[PDB]
Amino acid sequence: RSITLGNSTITTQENVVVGYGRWPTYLRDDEDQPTQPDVATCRFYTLDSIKWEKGSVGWWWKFPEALSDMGLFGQNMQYHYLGRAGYTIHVQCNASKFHQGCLLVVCVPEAEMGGAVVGQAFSATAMANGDKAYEFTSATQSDQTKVQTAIHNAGMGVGVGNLTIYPHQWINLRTNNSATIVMPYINSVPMDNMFRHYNFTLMVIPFVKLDYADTASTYVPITVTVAPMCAEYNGLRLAQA
Amino acid sequence: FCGSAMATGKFLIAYSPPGANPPKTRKDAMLGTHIIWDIGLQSSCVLCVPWISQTHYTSAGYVTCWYQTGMIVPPGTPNSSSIMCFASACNDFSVRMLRDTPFISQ
Amino acid sequence: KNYHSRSESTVENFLGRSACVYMEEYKTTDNDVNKKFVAWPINTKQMVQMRRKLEMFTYLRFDMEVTFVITSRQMPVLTHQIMYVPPGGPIPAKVDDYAWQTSTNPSIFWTEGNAPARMSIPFISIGNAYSNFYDGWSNFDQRGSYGYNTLNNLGHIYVRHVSGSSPHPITSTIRVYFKPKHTRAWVPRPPRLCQYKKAFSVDFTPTPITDTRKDINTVT
Fold it and tell me: Could you give the CA distance from residue C206 to residue C203 in angstroms, rounded to a whole number?
């Protein structure tokens, strides 16, 4: 019916796809290096609402750079040095029964993306820049300072059909309309600086284009809601003698 | 929400504490206390608000509401709907010292 | 044909194969000091086939072993100093300097006519696994190098010919074989579908997904 989730903001919704069968958990579940778990960080930081138009190709948001300007979480990234967090991502779209379309909501860990021109470098403002849904494009990209952005190769050169390895959920408008992906913390170092490294990239890819018939709303609003869970940081105080 | 039975969308009913200024953007509003009211799965959103006092400018709370998705309808449905609003005195109130109304004049 | 079962698809015996990775020559006497010894940063992104296999995983943890096959052509027995500089060691910039005499660089001394030289480098790194892919920057101003970290770095192998006061005018050729051991892998990743254009970048040019056929209904 409606299992109203409350944290400090409320989100009414009504499966959970765990990243690899591992829930987010503190590093303490395992002086010299004390840690400081911040337990006030979690709450639903709802991002902007993209419009799924008929002629659209796809969208991606780099994490944790999407939440770099979002409240307390944003502040802690500036203050503290080392930090680790897991995320509960709720991607919900709202559409009628006269709208037809398919989406692949996929969380890709560590996606390095090649430049548009082979053997050229691009700025950090070409991948992420606060909360923005960067848009994949049809055909090639010939703008030198941009990412490759060819939808069929997913901007990584891997083939778009094979992205089903990663924890993914399909939002087929015919039946369901919600995707919950609980991504745990995956890195090769216990905790890392949250500016240098973009941990994972969320991609929403329309596999079937929207057809809306006639005299109906021409866009389907896709909203992304991210709640950072079990976020730990580093202590800022001295140890005892 | 009193409207068509085929409309869907989301709203951000946001509450500002007594001292706080009303938010000027949806982004500002979202940082505070907010309820994402889904018009599709619910059609009534009940908000019990505390710290309601006489205050005889003034410190007063604010309830604002913002578009989040817009209204989406299928073919053959009106392009307008409305929202009605209700008010009550909740569980208990306390009133002290009689006074005449400043409405109907003698 | 019959069914049965498998155990040739385990990660350890998939990625664990001896494969040539570098071949170079050097002459003991010439006018170029560059060509009087061999340098070789260890990496597994030079042999295209080997690269593609390893890149189906994101994190890898292994301890390699390196075997050298050295031949020489023009009289007496000839010896080779096969030094290993580990990360953050001193590197020789010329043949004969104090960097060759460093005692913290494991150095084999192998003379010809004997079974090939070999040593097994352990798991060096201060991380908890090498990372094939890195989606970050070298600094937090984010203006540095892209897709490069120093925690996946491996040392260099420097080979020189141990010679007397005046060398011979011999020339030698080395071949290096490389084989992971006790491999563990974490996080799988889709196979490559483009031809590599750089040995360190992930740069590519778009290519069609699959080959075409006459008609959807037509199958022969």
Answer: 10
Q: What is the resolution of this structure in A?
A: 3.5
Cα–Cα distance measured from residue C26 to residue C161, given in angstroms and rounded to the nearest whole number: 9
Can you tell me the distance from the alpha carbon of C166 to that of A13, in angstroms, rounded to the nearest whole number?
83
Interface size A-B, in CB pairs within 8 Å, comes to 73
Q: Do C130 and A148 touch (CB under 8 A)?
A: no
| Angle, CA A192 vertex, CA A189 and CA A194 arms, to 5° | 150
DSSP letter string over C66-106? Answer: EEEEEEEE-----EEEEEEEPTT----SSSSSGGGS-TTS-
Method: cryo-EM
Which residues 46-105 in chain B show a CB within 8 A of chain A?
A: 68-76
Q: What domains sit in chain A, N to C, each tagged with a CATH number?
A: 3-234 (2.60.120.20)
Upper half-sphere CA count for residue A184 (Cβ side, 13 Å): 15
Residues 6+ apart with CB under 8 A from A168: A17, A104, A105, A106, A107, A181
Task: For residue A196, list chain C residues with Cβ-Cβ distance below 8 A.
Answer: 136-140, 142
Query: Which residues of A lie inside 8 Å of B (Cβ-Cβ)?
Result: 1-2, 8-14, 44-46, 49, 70-71, 94-99, 213-217, 219-221, 223, 225
Question: Which of A20, A65, A112 has the highest number of chain C CBs within 10 A, making it the mutation to test binding with C?
Answer: A112
